[PDB]
Amino acid sequence: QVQLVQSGGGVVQPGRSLRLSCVTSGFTFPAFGMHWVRQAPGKGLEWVAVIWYDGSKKYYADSVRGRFTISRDNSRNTLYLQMHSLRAEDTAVYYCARVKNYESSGYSQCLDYWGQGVLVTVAS
Amino acid sequence: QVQLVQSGGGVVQPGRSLRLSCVTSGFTFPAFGMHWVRQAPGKGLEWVAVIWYDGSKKYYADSVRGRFTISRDNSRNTLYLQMHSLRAEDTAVYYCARVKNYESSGYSQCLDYWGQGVLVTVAS
Amino acid sequence: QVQLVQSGGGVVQPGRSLRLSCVTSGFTFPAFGMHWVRQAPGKGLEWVAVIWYDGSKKYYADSVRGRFTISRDNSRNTLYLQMHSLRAEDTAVYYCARVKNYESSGYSQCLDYWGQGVLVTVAS
Amino acid sequence: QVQLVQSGGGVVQPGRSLRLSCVTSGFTFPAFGMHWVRQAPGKGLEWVAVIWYDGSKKYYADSVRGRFTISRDNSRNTLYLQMHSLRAEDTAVYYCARVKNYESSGYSQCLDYWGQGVLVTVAS
Amino acid sequence: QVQLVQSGGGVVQPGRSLRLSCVTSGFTFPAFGMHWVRQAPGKGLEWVAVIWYDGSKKYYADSVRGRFTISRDNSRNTLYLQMHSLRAEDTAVYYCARVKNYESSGYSQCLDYWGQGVLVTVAS
Amino acid sequence: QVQLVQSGGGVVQPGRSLRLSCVTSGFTFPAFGMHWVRQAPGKGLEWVAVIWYDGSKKYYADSVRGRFTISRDNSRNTLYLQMHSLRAEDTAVYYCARVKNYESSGYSQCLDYWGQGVLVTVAS
Amino acid sequence: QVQLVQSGGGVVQPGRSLRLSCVTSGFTFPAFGMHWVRQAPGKGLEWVAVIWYDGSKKYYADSVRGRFTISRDNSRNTLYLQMHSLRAEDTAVYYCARVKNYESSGYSQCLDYWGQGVLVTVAS
Amino acid sequence: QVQLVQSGGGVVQPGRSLRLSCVTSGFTFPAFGMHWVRQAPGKGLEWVAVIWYDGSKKYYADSVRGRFTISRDNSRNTLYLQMHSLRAEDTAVYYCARVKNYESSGYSQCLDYWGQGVLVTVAS
Amino acid sequence: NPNANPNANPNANPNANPNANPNANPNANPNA
Amino acid sequence: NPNANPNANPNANPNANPNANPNANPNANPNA
Amino acid sequence: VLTQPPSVSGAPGQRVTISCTGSSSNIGAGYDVHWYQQLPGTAPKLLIYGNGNRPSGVPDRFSGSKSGTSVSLAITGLQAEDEADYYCQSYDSSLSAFVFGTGTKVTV
Amino acid sequence: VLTQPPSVSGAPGQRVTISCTGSSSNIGAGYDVHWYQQLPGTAPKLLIYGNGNRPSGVPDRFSGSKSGTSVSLAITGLQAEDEADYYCQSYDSSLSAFVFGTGTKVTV
Amino acid sequence: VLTQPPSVSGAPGQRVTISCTGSSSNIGAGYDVHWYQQLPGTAPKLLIYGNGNRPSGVPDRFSGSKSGTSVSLAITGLQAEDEADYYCQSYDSSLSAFVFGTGTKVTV
Amino acid sequence: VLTQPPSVSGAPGQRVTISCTGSSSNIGAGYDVHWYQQLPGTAPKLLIYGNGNRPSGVPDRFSGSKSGTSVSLAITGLQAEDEADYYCQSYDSSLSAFVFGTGTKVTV
Amino acid sequence: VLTQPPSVSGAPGQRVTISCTGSSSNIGAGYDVHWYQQLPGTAPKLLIYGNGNRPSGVPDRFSGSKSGTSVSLAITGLQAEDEADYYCQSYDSSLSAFVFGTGTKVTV
Amino acid sequence: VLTQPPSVSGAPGQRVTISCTGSSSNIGAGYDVHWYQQLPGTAPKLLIYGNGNRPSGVPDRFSGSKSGTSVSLAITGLQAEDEADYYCQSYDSSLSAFVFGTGTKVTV
Amino acid sequence: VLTQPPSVSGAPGQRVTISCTGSSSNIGAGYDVHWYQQLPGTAPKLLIYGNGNRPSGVPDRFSGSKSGTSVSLAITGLQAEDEADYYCQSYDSSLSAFVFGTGTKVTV
Amino acid sequence: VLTQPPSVSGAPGQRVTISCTGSSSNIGAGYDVHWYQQLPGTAPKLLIYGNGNRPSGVPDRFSGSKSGTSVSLAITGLQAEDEADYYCQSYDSSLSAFVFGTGTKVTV
């Protein structure tokens, strides 16, 4: 019932911008904070950004701070990652992930539902 | 003594908007958060929206989010539901509910007093 | 030592406004929450409003909501009840009360010191 | 090591304002709440005002409320009491006292270290 | 091409609320200020309210102030008149009007395009 | 048709507070700034206070500043003057005035419609 | 020297959102206002939206209001048109145009430099 | 009729603080911005600080910025200059001045009414 | 700058004009 | 703190409690 | 607040005049007077705006004029289609509110 | 919302009991019931707070007790000074408002 | 999301039970299940809240209990007035939305 | 601050003038002087605003003019109903407060 | 909203004129009308602006003028390079929205 | 509000006790009572706090205890250095304000 | 920042353990670790959260335990369906960023 | 920042001029200069504002004029009452602060 679909991949020349979107359905979207996770081809996962449920607080990785921004348009279930000044390092498969609701003493955020995976290739 | 009376239903052409209101009496309305519940003709109940007592925090079901808007005019005991872009799926009897004041370990909101029931028909 | 002194009653034509004031002395007023209690002539007491110590949270009885407005001016030991749209039903003796400081498992607010009682008559 | 030094006394004609100050040293001033205590000539002590450690919450005696104002400049270890509309009864020796850190079941604020004592005289 | 279409009239018991809406099409609505004009049956026209283009400044006629509330929802070409505390005097045909764009030395607002006219009856 | 009616005067002991109100009808009250004018018994007029149309900007005469407070409750055509610390100098007839709409090179505010006149006596 | 390059076309199923972008170079982008113009296949041009130089004031055509959203990222010389709820009639070639600086008595905005033209097709 | 009186002089040991006040009468104090002017013994005048009428904008001299603060308590006609860390350079006669209301093309603030002059001697 | 007029002038028109133009002008110059 | 919980919990108690202590305590510990 | 004759009449083909008398704050202050035409039912339509400027779609027979503290609406021809209610409108600076006339019925 | 007998009585010297019956959200939810004494004129004064805690200044003859969904106020001695109106008070969580009893008149 | 049998029935005087099976985020997360009663027309009324706590006015014959990830509603007596539609309700933490049951009909 | 003669008088039918001398911040600053009329009781009514502009309802016999730093109110006819108290008003930029005149009495 | 002929034609070397008829609020209101030249593909470029002012780069064969509520675009030479669609543009005060013409095709 | 004897006395070397009687809201409410020692001039210093806990620097001749609604300050030795005024201090819940006693003078 | 073995293997039916070693600010600060299963393509899905809490839909053959500064995910059975890349995840106080492991490939 | 002569003198009855030379940001920016008269003690009072505008209460014997980057205050008569220190004042754009002159002493 919970679905996260993505769109916005392709080939982008270095230095150009690109915007990735994540359209969700089946759950109360305004009640969840979301993550973007990047997976370089053949490499491991690495974290990119997190947005609070309302969107006030946005925290980024060190390697993308100031170049990437994360935003949500809360009224139609869509999450955005606007990528500016795409270098040859930012070529990977981008995933849209959701923070699972659970409680523990040492709570560290976990991503229960993941998007399909959109490939961004910065080349030439 | 606790009374919830509803008005504002009728037949609405698809793509038009309609507003449902629920005027209360007999209790301290600013102190209670209310729900809207919808029952398609011949089907079971399903949830629509919830509003906090002051009106700051509102949460909508997925199927009606971005089109509906719940609110309350607190100084005269009135709860509203503004529905825009009314599709043919949104035809049902809409109930106005009141969240009961109770304390438990596994608290999950319950609706103790319900409105009369107002029929919204989206046709032609 | 604790004193509550009231004023501001009289005969009011229906539909007009009136303000009742209650000037306190003998205690740290900004640290206490105060009520208003109304007694129709020959009937039992009934509740009108409550205001927190700072004045943030105000709750009215149903029969007075939207017309009556409670407030406190904290820097000169005074409490007000602004009454608008006075109907013939709002004729009674209005008391100014103080919430007593006590603790218990089943805490419910009690009014230990009461005002002198002021008559508001809505006629002709 | 602890020290509270005061200044600002003198003779003030009735109706005029006056400010007392209390400079502290030897302890972490921002971390302690403070009182002002007034002693009429030949009479017992009486309480005037208390201010929290940060200055958020302040409470005054009845006979000085709306005229007196207590404040702290937390960045330079000083405490003030601003007196307005000085009447003839506000003549006394004003002491600056510090709230002692101790824990007990029936906790009531005690003043362990006191200022030197400043005389304020209201005449003519 | 310019069209003003109204709805929301009917029979209202005195003391109840009612909302009139006016959905516009054919022109840049957020750039125009709109009026409400009321015509008691068999009498001449009279003014009810005005709202600026953004909705910042709203001015009501004396006989409707404090009960009627004018507003516009600018993103879907709609204009509302929320009527509370409906007396028997507020029975009339309510028109939705548009302020014509023209310039002159003695500028006074004129209403070039009018709504269809909606009847509000306050009886029983 | 333009009417200003006043109420709230009487005999007040010195040091007590009193509130004067001025209920208007026949014009667009939110669009007019109003004055209060005082006339000591057997003396000429003198100015007391002025309030802007929205109520943001208020200006008081020197002799009444810090004790008086002018305000307006804009949604029901009411102009107030709250007088505290009423001395024996503040005994006079208080007039409620309306600023006339006129344009001139040497504009200085003029009061075209005046209230009936309410007598405030500060005695004993 | 002046250049307007566009991107973001393609085929979008009805009801889905799409964003067009227009990157500018050769002129001081923050100092100019911009338009979007849509040309249906085989039909004449028509206006869609205009945005001021700073982005404070935006105006849309009737048939695209509430669905389309024009915005500018002023720090990197780019212009956007965010299209929501794409209907079947919103299929056309979208041109990005710049408002020319000229002065005349009957000033009406003219578009001197135009973008390349991006095709948007809504089908299936 | 216009009077500006000052108080708060004396001898202050270097490094100590001192607060100067300026009580005004005879004019609408909240409508005027005020200046402090310092005159070293036998030397010329030199500007110290300026405060806007409401007090939002406060501009200081270079030689006292960060050590001196200027403030006004608008409800009882009193202007303050709080002097911290008094060096041996800040020994002078301090004047309280008022900005005169006049209009010109090259408007530069002029001080029409001056206080009596309070001597501050920082020695030993 | 300190040269801005700091006074209040409690003589400005305290009233409001409902008769002002309530329409906006999409045709005004959008360029700086 | 990137590790704070960014979720809303829609079933939190949506009601107010008029029967809560409306008084304040001057006697609470003013230190920290 | 603006005074108009209760009704005016005339045989078809001839000219009639409808007046609108206001005070020194209605029309004496220089505020334009607009005219609306009200057929039975049929929400009113602008007929003349700004003291004689005739909008597009209104035939030439309707013209207006301002004189002193009153204006007027001259109707020539007076065809059967001119049977309606005519209302003024302007701004009263002392009330600070828009004022409509009492309305006249042209009956032909 | 809290029910009380219209009146109770008794010869001086003997004991009387005034009851206050409330629902499951008044006293069944655990909310304390307070009692006020109303002489003619004479704005009411607290008599017993929190289900039997007697404030300073009230003689020992007045005591209260809670049982099930109702409380009671036992008055012993019943002197002439006890002729008054006695009102309950508590909190109704379903109404979310403070409720007073109907009041009883002790007549001696 | 909460699943109920399409219908249950029984002869009058006999006890019937209605089950409500949920997931690990509905009932296995510890969220109370409330039960409603729907007559023809007649907007649903709360029957049992918090896994069996019976509000005022609901007769003793209605009871409930929780077991594992499912709840139940035991109706004894089963009179003619007990013919109605019975709906669950709780909160789904993963969906973060209040979820009603499918609904069952008691026929007698 | 604005100064007026304590009283003026004249036989009916004869013209009288009332002066209002101000400073360089009252009238010498270019601020209009308004004139009011006070009967016994009867809150003052505006008589002449803006240095002679006569509002609606005030008869022609009242006029005013400004000269230097002083203004005047010329009353012709001087009938029995003209016995009243006449007050100035303007703005004082140095005081930044509206200043009324001392007030004069016309006796006839 | 602005009306133009479907197409115009003429032998190369001769003159042609394209008309643009507007209402009293588009061109009769005094708003300038601009013309754009649209080749196949090739996003339209400004041709004349403000009733005939030529931007730099446009050959002198293009000119325009304003007359009443309609304007014209005079093309001399009429070369093969002029095969394009020409569109008007002006601002409509009644709609308060920019208006483009239906456009004319020049076929030579 | 707290009541103390005007003065106490005793020969040096013997024991004396200072009483401090409070109401049910000062000491009967469980609030600690602190004692301050006031020499002539010489701003008072904390003597005992919290019903007899001695701060550092106070000789062991000072002690206190709590009994019902009143407390006591027992001084042994009663030396010439004890000539001073002793003040209570505690918090009054009914006034919600800190309360100091009337103070007792020890004359030895 | 979290260290994992490059790959693990094992015959079907046998138990295999995958380790994850962190620092003092990744594990020693008490932050739970989560484990994700990444198939070819097929975006990773949650496997184990909060140090061993198994979400619904994941078979019981997966388990985990935390010890000191290292955590492990023990797999039993180890069928063909379990060939995938398993990643850690936690929060780093020092970097103030979430950290993922290098991931291990299970090849059976 | 503004430069003045150290002192000036003159026999009574004769005219004396006091100069004030500023920079481009003090005078050349067009900011008026004001002149104050300082007696012994006796806090300075405004003499001339806005380049020669004489406030009321100041005798006409004082005047001023601006020329280039220097301003002057000419005194005529020069009696004994004019023995005082005269200071300039203006605004400095560069320092963003008001500047006073060094002041000159008039000794007749």
Numbering used by the authors:
A (entry chain A), B (entry chain H), C (entry chain C), D (entry chain E), E (entry chain O), F (entry chain Q), ...: 1 to 52, 52A, 53 to 82, 82A, 82B, 82C, 83 to 100, 100A, ...
I (entry chain J), J (entry chain I): 1 to 32
K (entry chain P), L (entry chain D), M (entry chain L), N (entry chain R), O (entry chain N), P (entry chain F), ...: 3 to 9, 11 to 27, 27A, 27B, 27C, 28 to 95, 95A, 95B, ...
What does the paper say about this structure?
Many malaria vaccine candidates, like RTS,S, are based on P. falciparum circumsporozoite protein (PfCSP), which is the primary surface antigen of P. falciparum sporozoites, the stage of malaria parasites infectious to humans. The structure of PfCSP comprises three domains: (1) a flexible N-terminus, which contains a heparin sulfate binding site for hepatocyte attachment; (2) a central repeat region composed of 25 to 40 major (NANP) repeats, which are interspersed by a few, N-terminal minor repeats (NVDP, NPDP); and (3) a small, structured C-terminal domain. In each complex, CSP displays some form of helical structure that is stabilized by homotypic interfaces between tightly packed Fabs bound along the length of the NPNA repeats.
The 227 Fab complex is distinct, as the NPNA repeats form two discontinuous, anti-parallel disc-like structures with moderate helical pitch and left-handed curvature, with each disc bound by 4 Fabs in tandem. However, we note the 227 Fab structure was solved in complex with NPNA8 peptide instead of rsCSP, as was done for the rest of the mAbs in the panel, due to the tendency of the 227-rsCSP complex to aggregate. Thus, the two antiparallel disc structures in the 227 complex likely comprise two individual NPNA8 peptides, as the four available NPNA2 epitopes on the peptide are fully occupied by 227 Fabs and there is no density linking the two discs. Nonetheless, a NS-EM reconstruction of the 227-rsCSP complex is nearly identical to the 227-NPNA8 cryo-EM structure, within the 15–20 Å limit of the NS data. Therefore, this antibody may induce dimerization of separate CSP molecules mediated by homodimeric interactions of the Fabs themselves, which may have important implications for the way this antibody engages PfCSP on sporozoites. In the symmetric secondary interface of 227, H82A of HFR3E mediates a cation-pi bond with R75 of HFR3B. Moreover, the H82A-R75 interaction contributes nearly half of the BSA of this interface (250/550Å2) and defines the C2 symmetry axis of the 227-rsCSP complex, suggesting a critical role for this interaction. Protection for these mAbs generally ranges from around 85–92%. mAb 239 is slightly less potent than 317, at 81% inhibition, while 337 and 227 have the lowest levels of protection in the panel, at 68 and 52% inhibition, respectively (p < 0.001; Mann–Whitney U test).
